[PDB]
C-alpha cells in the first residue's frame, strides 16, 4: 500500500506515495507518527490541513495519491500512514502499510555515557545491577560491551535498541545483573560503548 522506507537529505523535498489502488473519486488522509508518539492527522480530503500543520506539508489533488514535504528537517522523521477512501466502497477499513521517512546528513554526535554502580539498598537486598545509560548520539547505532577487570562479561547483560529523543539524537541503556559476591570480588567493572568506530569506556569499582 505504501513503501516501507524513504530517505532524504535535509532541506530537499520528500514525496511519499500512498498504498493506492483507488478507482474513481478519492478522499485521502495522511497521518504522521513520530518515534514514541501517538499518530497526528496531517492531511485530509487529499489536500486539507488541520489547523497547526506547516505549509511545508501538502497533499496531491484527486491512485498514486502523494504527500509532499518540502524543506524537510530532522524533526519530520516519522512513519507516514495514508488512509484511502473512494466512491467505490462505503468504507475502507484499511490503513496504508506506511512509509518510514529518514533524514540524511545529520551532524554526528558522540554518546554521553553514565555508569551507575549497584545501590547499597539493592546490595542489602542480595541483588546487584550495574546501569549503563547512553544518550545524545547520532547516528543511532551502538555496540555495548561489559568487562570485569579486563575480562569480557558474557552473561547477565541486557541492552536496548536505540530510540530517538525529542532533540533528534538517540538514547540506549545497558544493564548488567550480578550477585553481590560477583560485584565485591573484582577490582572494577566497565561499560564500553562503541559508536562510529570509536569507543568510550566508563568504569566503576566497589568502594
Amino acid at each position: 500500500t505504501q513503501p516501507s522506507q524513504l530517505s532524504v537529505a535535509p532541506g530537499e523535498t520528500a514525496r511519499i506515495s500512498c498504498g493506492g489502488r483507488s478507482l474513481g473519486s478519492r478522499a485521502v488522509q495522511w497521518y504522521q507518527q513520530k518515534p514514541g508518539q501517538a499518530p497526528v492527522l496531517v492531511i485530509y480530503n487529499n489536500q486539507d490541513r488541520p489547523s497547526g500543520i506547516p505549509e511545508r506539508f501538502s497533499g496531491s489533488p484527486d491512485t498514486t495519491a502523494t504527500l509532499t514535504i518540502s524543506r524537510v528537517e530532522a524533526g519530520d522523521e516519522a512513519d507516514y500512514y495514508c488512509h484511502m477512501w473512494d466512491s467505490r466502497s462505503a468504507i475502507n477499513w484499511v490503513f496504508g502499510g506506511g512509509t518510514k521517512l529518514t533524514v540524511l546528513g545529520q551532524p554526528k554526535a558522540a554518546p554521553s555515557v553514565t555508569l551507575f554502580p549497584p545501590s547499597s539498598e539493592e546490595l542489602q537486598a542480595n541483588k546487584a545491577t550495574l546501569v549503563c545509560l547512553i544518550s545524545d548520539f547520532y547516528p543511532g547505532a551502538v555496540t555495548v560491551a561489559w568487562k570485569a577487570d579486563s575480562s569480557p562479561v558474557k552473561a547477565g547483560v541486557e541492552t536496548t535498541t536505540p530510540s530517538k529523543q525529542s532533540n533528534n539524537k538517540y538514547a540506549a541503556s545497558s544493564y548488567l545483573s550480578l550477585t553481590p559476591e560477583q560485584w565485591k570480588s573484582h577490582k572494577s567493572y566497565s561499560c564500553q560503548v562503541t559508536h562510529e568506530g570509536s569507543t568510550v569506556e566508563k568504569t566503576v569499582a566497589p568502594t
Binding site: 499518530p39 497526528v40 477512501w85 466512491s87 506506511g98 551507575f116 545509560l133 541503556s173
Partner: protein
C-alpha cells in the same frame, strides 16, 4: 478542548475478554463519532471500529466480530470490549475523535457523493499485553549522585525501576514540578521476560545540598506507586 485518555488492565490472559475505556474531557461524548485503533509492536495501524450516539457502530471484519463499542453519557466515556483475546491482540490501543465529510463527484440529486472519515484528535494510547504470566510490581532503587556521576558542575541522579511486568511504567520527579533535565529511558525487555527502566535527572551540583529529589514511579497494572527519595553518597 477535547482530551482523550485510554485506560486498560495492561495485562490480560489468553481467551479472556479485554475491556478498555476512553475518558474524554472538554467535550461531550454525544457530539462526535469515536474510533479505536491499535498498533502491534513494529507493525502498522489497524482501525478497530467506530461508534456514535445514534447507536451507529461499525466494526472492521479483521477483528472477527469479537468487538463491541459503547457510549456512557453519564461518565462521558467510550468503551471497548474484545472477546477471546490471543497474543495476536497485544498492542497499543488508541481512542480518537472521528470526523466525517462528504466528497461530491457528481450530481448530488443522483446522490453521487461519498462519505469519508478522518481521526483528528488521538489519545496517547494504552498498552495491552496478552500473556498467561502474572503482573509483577517493580522494585525501585536510588541511583545516587556521586563524583563518579558528576561532570563539570552538573550532576546525574536517578531511579532504577527493576523487574516489572507488564508495561507501562510512568515516572515523574517531585510530583511533576521537576521537568527540566529529566530523561526517562525506554525499558529493556530482559531474557527473563521482565522489564527494567531508568530515569535520570541532570541537576546543578550546587543544588545537591539544598534541594530534595524524589522519583514518582507508577505501575498501574499492579496498582502500585512508589515515591523514592534520592540522596547523595
Amino acid at each position: 478542548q477535547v482530551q482523550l485518555q485510554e485506560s486498560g488492565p495492561g495485562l490480560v490472559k489468553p481467551s479472556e475478554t479485554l475491556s478498555l475505556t476512553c475518558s474524554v474531557s472538554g467535550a461531550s461524548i454525544s457530539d462526535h463519532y469515536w474510533s479505536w485503533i491499535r498498533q502491534s509492536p513494529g507493525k502498522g495501524l489497524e482501525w478497530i471500529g467506530y461508534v456514535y450516539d445514534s447507536g451507529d457502530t461499525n466494526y472492521n471484519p479483521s477483528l472477527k466480530s469479537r468487538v463491541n463499542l459503547s457510549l456512557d453519557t453519564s461518565k462521558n466515556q467510550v468503551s471497548l470490549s474484545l472477546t477471546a483475546v490471543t497474543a495476536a491482540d497485544s498492542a497499543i490501543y488508541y481512542c480518537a475523535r472521528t470526523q466525517h465529510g462528504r466528497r461530491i463527484y457528481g450530481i448530488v440529486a443522483f446522490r453521487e457523493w461519498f462519505t469519508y472519515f478522518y481521526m483528528d484528535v488521538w489519545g496517547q494510547g494504552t498498552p495491552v499485553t496478552v500473556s498467561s504470566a502474572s503482573t509483577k510490581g517493580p522494585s525501585v532503587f536510588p541511583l545516587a549522585p556521586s563524583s563518579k556521576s558528576t561532570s563539570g558542575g552538573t550532576a546525574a541522579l536517578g531511579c532504577l525501576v527493576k523487574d516489572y511486568f507488564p508495561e507501562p511504567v510512568t515516572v515523574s520527579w517531585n510530583s511533576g514540578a521537576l521537568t527540566s533535565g529529566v530523561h526517562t529511558f525506554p525499558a529493556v525487555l530482559q531474557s527473563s521476560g521482565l522489564y527494567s527502566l531508568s530515569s535520570v535527572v541532570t541537576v546543578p551540583s550546587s543544588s545537591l545540598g539544598t534541594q530534595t529529589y524524589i522519583c514518582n514511579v507508577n505501575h498501574k497494572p499492579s496498582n502500585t506507586k512508589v515515591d523514592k527519595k534520592v540522596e547523595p553518597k
